[PDB]
Amino acid sequence: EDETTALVCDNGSGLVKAGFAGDDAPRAVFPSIVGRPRHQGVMVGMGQKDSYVGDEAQSKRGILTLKYPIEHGIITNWDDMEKIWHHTFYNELRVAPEEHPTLLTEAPLNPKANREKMTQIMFETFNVPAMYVAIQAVLSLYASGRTTGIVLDSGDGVTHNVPIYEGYALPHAIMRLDLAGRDLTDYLMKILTERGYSFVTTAEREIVRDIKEKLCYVALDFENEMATAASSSSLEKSYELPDGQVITIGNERFRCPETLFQPSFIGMESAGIHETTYNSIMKCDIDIRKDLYANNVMSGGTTMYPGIADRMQKEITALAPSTMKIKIIAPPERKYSVWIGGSILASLSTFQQMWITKQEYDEAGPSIVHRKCF
Amino acid sequence: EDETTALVCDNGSGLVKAGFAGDDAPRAVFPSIVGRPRHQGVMVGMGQKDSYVGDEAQSKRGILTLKYPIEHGIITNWDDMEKIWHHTFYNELRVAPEEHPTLLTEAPLNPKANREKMTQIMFETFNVPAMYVAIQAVLSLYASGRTTGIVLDSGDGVTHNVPIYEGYALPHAIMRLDLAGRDLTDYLMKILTERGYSFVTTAEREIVRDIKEKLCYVALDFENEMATAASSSSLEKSYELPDGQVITIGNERFRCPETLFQPSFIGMESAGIHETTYNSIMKCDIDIRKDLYANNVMSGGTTMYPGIADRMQKEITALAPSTMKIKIIAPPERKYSVWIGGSILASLSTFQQMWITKQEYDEAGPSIVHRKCF
Amino acid sequence: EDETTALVCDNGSGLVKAGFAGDDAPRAVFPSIVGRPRHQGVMVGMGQKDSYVGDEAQSKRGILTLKYPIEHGIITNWDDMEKIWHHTFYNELRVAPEEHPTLLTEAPLNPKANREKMTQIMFETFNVPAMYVAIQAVLSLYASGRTTGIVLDSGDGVTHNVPIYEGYALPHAIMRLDLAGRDLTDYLMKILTERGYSFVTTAEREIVRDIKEKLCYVALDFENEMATAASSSSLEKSYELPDGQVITIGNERFRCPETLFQPSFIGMESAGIHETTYNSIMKCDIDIRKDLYANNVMSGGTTMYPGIADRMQKEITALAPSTMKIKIIAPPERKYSVWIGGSILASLSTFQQMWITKQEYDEAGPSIVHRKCF
Amino acid sequence: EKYSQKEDKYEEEIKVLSDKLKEAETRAEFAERSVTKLEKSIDDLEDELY
Amino acid sequence: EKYSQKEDKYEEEIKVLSDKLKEAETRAEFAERSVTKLEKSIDDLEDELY
């Protein structure tokens, strides 16, 4: 065949998004979890199966202890990551990696060891002709079809912010902020406890993740919505657990995403996500700032909450000069924007010479990641 | 076609003014800047484009470091000048230089190497039938339509002064003074710092150039205007940055052009521009001085400030004999006076025999510039 | 008593250095930090104490958010500066300012508002008979006992450069460069992240400040030392955190001070500190340059790194004419050179008439700072 | 602990001699490089005087 | 015992660093004599060249 296709995988924490390069959507999207039978089984003709990977672990949740292998964009456990990639290629996509070049995404300001060990596994585990590791935020920018913007990337791993102008990139102005979907989940199960609902274990920690994926929203003013929580009507929502227990969540619902704009609630000094965007834009040159204000791109899974775009717009407009208009461009489909940006990149004809070849790795070693790529 | 037209380029520092000879205004006027991508770009399908030239560099300012290739009438970097001329001919005018004789302007008391290397490039880079290098001040005098005057030429490159009488010219009485638009810009960004506004980089150095191109004016008395700066009302002006930041500049505004009349502010001993004009007129013969006092011509871009003509008139009248009347003739349009003087010169029928031919260069070499022309 | 003693305070950013004039060393040196209880306390019989000032804040770091009140030689917050001076006088020195004239240092090319508001506080907060505000670089020159030199002043606030000849001073040749100890700290915590160590908050930002105060050094050639970082042996150093966590820093150590000589690493165009020294010396008159090359004085806290003097010597000797010998005089004790220069100045008998009196302020207002003093 | 204190005294002296060695090596390397600059500038003077 | 051995390992690091420092300092001071000899020869060659 011509061009050989190519393969693209996004592994921020929480979800593997994977598929062929040259398509508009990934074939396989599943949770990045390795769930191990904690309870010793007593039957004959079970499994045994040392561990379960992917949405198999979601189905068989109650037995398992679940371990996310990626925390804060950092792989904690390498064998668990290899198992997840083994699951992507053989269980879903049914590809031999020898037949495809593979793009990986990776997060900004990330330890060198993750990029270098990630390449070491791609060559010396799944034999592969070529690969690339690319920055998450630039891929979302490509997916949005814009040449310029400040990309606010927040996954389940960590929050990142990369300003770009006309292509280029500003290394000093790149900001990484330790907040995530996962930290909002840990805050959320903590704020359910005051209501009497106690979720203590990894299995129902993913149940509050599912709650937060739909019920939670961001206030267009926090204090105003917290004041109208005195007359509870629309702010309460009934939620059904898989147990058949019913949960009723009021003001507790919208103050969980409020943590992004008030990290004093989590107990971290690190500024809210709108001030981090100001911190990135202020580090940029005076000239370009006009379009960075007007071309803010949201990406990732934890920018999905209803009303985030409006809240960021009101806060950035309030802080900034009202001399210029602050447009925020946050697409629906923004969850998959990194994978789509990886699809478009590996489909680019020129990019087919910028691959890290297997040959170039075999001569010059794993350290060449940083030398060739950003 | 008859006469073949001709081409005219003014390159003092800061601006290329270029167009056809035989027209009242140049087609193309743009900043003489070569701006290089300092920040490594990370996308695919950018440019690449090693450098940007002209007002392209003004548009994409924040990425670029900008290098003026001409300093003090001296070309610092030759490849950068060749790139600027390549941009004039192909990007704007769309001419083959083989089809046109080309006039260049050049500044008085200027190193021989600039004239000789300038001719060497015109023949052996853009193949051209003929060329001429001419003095800036005489061209402005032609543009003003006068046969006699003392031409005060101040561009962004350097300040020059050439007395002329009935045509002729006085080599000993020619004065060159190292002050410019650019030195006023460096003074200006230094005097903004006491107000808290700090402009540290080449990109916003051209933002204070734009400020100074409109906000700045010259005091009809410096001390009187500095005294009325105690009651700030009209002397402050709000200025909008491209960032959306607002700048408010009071007495700082008019004391920037004051440097022309007080080079003790810049720290140079070299006399103010009115005493340099006296220094030129005093070196002239006694007989002609009467009309040189009454026929002072201002030219160039840094004589554009409001109230310069009035201040020069008051100071020269104060120093000189009040026995004779000191008229200063400073036209609006004085910015383009050198280019218009080059347009009129190449349109002159007799001048069409005084061209340096390509043939005469090929026989007698680059050194013939000084031998044929002034 | 005779002469009344006098008081001297250096407030560049980062450290208050204070003591009596007429002594060789300051009594009190402490960090210029106002640290506020961010976490609400729950006990009875605490404090309360709205905020902590000085090395009290260093001791109780983890609770506090720390705010430097001076950034880039500019006081951001005035009440916080007043609190710091209240701490110097009452907590350490135990003086009534009514009984002593007070010298303040201040940085070159600094906003007028800092000098004028600084005097306004000294008269109308701590009632004082007299005061002076003086330039940092001239005081270090006095402390070094030399009449001539180019003083490279770099604190935690900003970097400054003042050439002096036989006393005198050159206003046009004074250069201010926005680099500091603090910007090296922000670069350093950014370059630790690639190793996996993530310091996200103000409290451990001062832990990387402590690391950089001893571990960091400047390469006598950057590329050579970065090449020998392939065989890691002496370039790694174990560092102990107050947590009991161990940090191991290799090539990352010496490329943090390298930023002074390569501001492309921070992303600023503004030239390295050796080219800024050339920029200052080139703006000076031709005659004096011979001794300015041979009498470069380093001052401030961020000239303390091992090997800075040797690197500056090699680079300035490489750029300059090797016709003349480039001696750099960088004393140990160079950290306190500004305070010692203030001690010697207020001990000078003639200087006791050049004080800004309280009386002269009461008649002629706060604006008289610039009128009397440099 | 008397060993740990000797290990600390040595570690202080190891830092002093490792730093003194890195400084003496910076001096040895400075002298090698200064010698190399003056190997070049001797040869330039040898060739220029020649 | 491991701390006695570390007393020796650290003492050995001091001894090795003392020997390496003596070499780095002796080589630096010798190479500094090569600096001063090359430099003096360069000045003498410049006086001759002049």
DSSP states of A267-295 as a string?
T--S--HHHHHHHHHHHS-TTTHHHHHH-
Residue B172 contacts A where some CB pair is shorter than 8 Å: no
What φ, ψ does residue B37 adopt, rounded to 5°?
A: -55, 100
Contact at 8 Å (CB) between A259 and A168? no
D26–C307 C-beta distance less than 8 A: yes
* Cβ-based neighbour number of residue C283 at 10 Å: 18
- Alpha-carbon distance of C281 to C175, in angstroms, equals 10
Q: What is the bridge-based pairing of β-strands A34-37 and A52-53?
A: antiparallel
Comparing alpha-carbon positions, the chain B residue that sits nearest to C370 is B194
Which chain D residues contact residue C310 at CB under 8 A?
Answer: 26, 30
Tally: H helices and E strands in chain E? 1, 0
* Cβ-based neighbour number of residue A121 at 10 Å: 18
Q: Which of A111, A170, A176 sits opposite C195 (nearest CB)?
A: A111
- Alpha-carbon distance of C119 to C125, in angstroms, equals 10
Q: Residue C26: helix, strand or coil by DSSP?
A: coil
What's the start-to-end Cα distance of chain A, in Å? 30
Q: Is B285 exposed, middle or buried (0-12, 13-18, 19+ CB in 10 A)?
A: exposed
Nearest to C188 by CA among C242, C137, C253, C283: C253
- Alpha-carbon distance of C361 to A43, in angstroms, equals 94
Comparing alpha-carbon positions, the chain C residue that sits nearest to B39 is C267
* Cβ-based neighbour number of residue B287 at 10 Å: 8
Q: Which residue has the tokens 């610039």?
A: C370
Which chain C residues contact residue A170 at CB under 8 A?
Answer: 267
Contact at 8 Å (CB) between B101 and B345? no
B3's enclosing H/E stretch is: none
B196–C113 C-beta distance less than 8 A: yes
Q: Is B318 exposed, middle or buried (0-12, 13-18, 19+ CB in 10 A)?
A: exposed
Q: Which of D18, D21, D26 sits opposite C220 (nearest CB)?
A: D26
The type of residue at A127 is N
Which chain A residues contact residue B246 at CB under 8 A?
Answer: 321, 323
Q: Which of E6, E28, E45 sits opposite D31 (nearest CB)?
A: E28
Please tell me which chains touch C, using 3 or more CB pairs under 8 Å as the contact test: A, B, D
**Minimum distance, in Å, between the CA of residue A310 and any CA atom of chain B:** 21
* Cβ-based neighbour number of residue B283 at 10 Å: 14
This structure's resolution (angstroms)?
10.2
**Minimum distance, in Å, between the CA of residue A269 and any CA atom of chain C:** 6
Q: What are the distances in angstroms from CA C144 to CA B322, C106, C139, C336? A: 56, 18, 9, 11
CA atoms within 13 A on the CB side of B162: 22
What determination technique applies here? cryo-EM
- Alpha-carbon distance of C90 to C110, in angstroms, equals 28
Query: What is the residue-wise DSSP string for C258-294?
Result: HTTT-TTTTT--S--HHHHHHHHHHHS-TTTHHHHHH
Which chain B residues contact residue A135 at CB under 8 A?
Answer: 42
Tokens of B338: 């050198």
Residue E35 contacts D where some CB pair is shorter than 8 Å: yes
Long-range CB contacts for residues A142-148, cutoff 8 Å, separation at least 24: A142/A340, A142/A341, A142/A344, A142/A345, A142/B43, A143/A299, A143/A337, A143/A338, A143/A340, A143/A341, A143/A344, A144/A297, A144/A329, A144/A331, A144/A337, A146/A295, A146/A297, A146/A329, A147/B43, A148/A288, A148/A291, A148/A292, A148/A295
What's the start-to-end Cα distance of chain D, in Å? 67
List D8's β-bridge partners, or say none.
none
- Alpha-carbon distance of C220 to E22, in angstroms, equals 21
- Alpha-carbon distance of C37 to C46, in angstroms, equals 12
Contact at 8 Å (CB) between A263 and A272? yes
Q: What is the bridge-based pairing of β-strands C74-75 and C70-71?
A: antiparallel
Tokens of C93: 């020195």
b vs e for C299-322, b when ≥16 Cβ sit within 10 Å of the residue's Cβ? Answer: bbbbbbbbbbbbbbbbbbbeebee
Residues 6+ apart with CB under 8 A from C248: C236, C237, C238, C239
Nearest to A152 by CA among A132, A172, A179, A134: A179
Q: What are the distances in angstroms from CA C141 to CA A218, B178, C242? A: 58, 32, 38
Which chain A residues contact residue C202 at CB under 8 A?
Answer: 269
Residue A172 contacts C where some CB pair is shorter than 8 Å: yes
Residue D5 contacts E where some CB pair is shorter than 8 Å: no
Q: Fill in the DSSP letter of residue B355.
A: S
Residue D36 contacts E where some CB pair is shorter than 8 Å: no
Tokens of B321: 């004999």
- Alpha-carbon distance of B216 to B189, in angstroms, equals 13
Residue C202 contacts A where some CB pair is shorter than 8 Å: yes
Tokens of C353: 């008439």
Handedness of CA A68, A73, A76, A81 (dihedral sign): positive
Which chain A residues contact residue B199 at CB under 8 A?
Answer: 286
Residue C359 contacts A where some CB pair is shorter than 8 Å: no
**Minimum distance, in Å, between the CA of residue C207 and any CA atom of chain B:** 30
Any alpha helices (H) in B215-355, and if so which ranges?
222-228, 252-258, 273-283, 289-294, 308-319, 337-347
**Minimum distance, in Å, between the CA of residue A112 and any CA atom of chain C:** 5
- Alpha-carbon distance of A228 to E34, in angstroms, equals 84
- Alpha-carbon distance of B124 to B117, in angstroms, equals 10
**Minimum distance, in Å, between the CA of residue A339 and any CA atom of chain B:** 15
Tokens of A203: 């299995």
What φ, ψ does residue B152 adopt, rounded to 5°?
A: -90, 105
b vs e for C55-93, b when ≥16 Cβ sit within 10 Å of the residue's Cβ? Answer: ebbbeebeebbbbbbbbbbbbeeeebbebbbebbbeebb
Q: Residue B311: helix, strand or coil by DSSP?
A: helix
Contact at 8 Å (CB) between B88 and B118? no
Cis before A353? omega within 30: no
Q: Which of C38, C65, C267 sits opposite A172 (nearest CB)?
A: C267
- Alpha-carbon distance of C360 to E44, in angstroms, equals 63
Q: Looking at chain D, how many residues does it have?
A: 50
Contact at 8 Å (CB) between C321 and C329? no
A110–C194 C-beta distance less than 8 A: yes
Residues 6+ apart with CB under 8 A from A46: none
- Alpha-carbon distance of B182 to B189, in angstroms, equals 11
B47's enclosing H/E stretch is: none
**Minimum distance, in Å, between the CA of residue C110 and any CA atom of chain A:** 21
Comparing alpha-carbon positions, the chain D residue that sits nearest to E17 is D17
Handedness of CA A326, A327, A332, A334 (dihedral sign): negative
C267–B39 C-beta distance less than 8 A: yes
Contact at 8 Å (CB) between C236 and C207? no
Q: Which residue has the tokens 């590791």?
A: A133
- Alpha-carbon distance of B27 to B94, in angstroms, equals 11
Contact at 8 Å (CB) between A7 and A97? yes
**Minimum distance, in Å, between the CA of residue A301 and any CA atom of chain C:** 23
**Minimum distance, in Å, between the CA of residue C287 and any CA atom of chain B:** 14
**Minimum distance, in Å, between the CA of residue D14 and any CA atom of chain E:** 6
B134's enclosing H/E stretch is: strand B130-135
- Alpha-carbon distance of B42 to B63, in angstroms, equals 13
Residue B190 contacts C where some CB pair is shorter than 8 Å: yes
C198–A172 C-beta distance less than 8 A: no
Q: Residue C339: helix, strand or coil by DSSP?
A: helix
Contact at 8 Å (CB) between B164 and B152? no
Q: Which of D11, D28, D39 sits opposite E10 (nearest CB)?
A: D11
- Alpha-carbon distance of C4 to B122, in angstroms, equals 75
Comparing alpha-carbon positions, the chain C residue that sits nearest to A270 is C201
B39–C111 C-beta distance less than 8 A: no
Query: What is the residue-wise DSSP string for A170-208?
Result: -TTT-EEES--HHHHHHHHHHHHGGGT----SHHHHHHH
Which chain D residues contact residue C234 at CB under 8 A?
Answer: 18, 21-22
- Alpha-carbon distance of A346 to A318, in angstroms, equals 40
CA atoms within 13 A on the CB side of A325: 2
Q: What are the distances in angstroms from CA B47 to CA A167, B43, B60, E48? A: 9, 10, 13, 56
What's the start-to-end Cα distance of chain C, in Å? 30
What's the start-to-end Cα distance of chain E, in Å? 69
Contact at 8 Å (CB) between A266 and A187? yes
Residue C112 contacts B where some CB pair is shorter than 8 Å: yes
Tokens of B20: 């056809």
Tokens of B233: 């009302």
Any alpha helices (H) in C144-201, and if so which ranges?
181-192
Query: What is the residue-wise DSSP string for A48-96?
Result: --S-EETHHHHHTTTTEEEE-SEETTEES-HHHHHHHHHIIIIIII---
Query: What is the residue-wise DSSP string for B136-200?
Result: HHHHHHHHTT-S-EEEEEE-SS-EEEEEESSS---TTT-EEES--HHHHHHHHHHHHGGGT----
Query: What is the residue-wise DSSP string for B63-131?
Result: TEEEE-SEETTEES-HHHHHHHHHIIIIIII---GGGS-EEEEE-TT--HHHHHHHHHHHHHTS--SEE
Q: Do chains A and D touch (3 or more CB pairs under 8 A)?
A: no
CA atoms within 13 A on the CB side of C337: 32
Tokens of C255: 């490329």
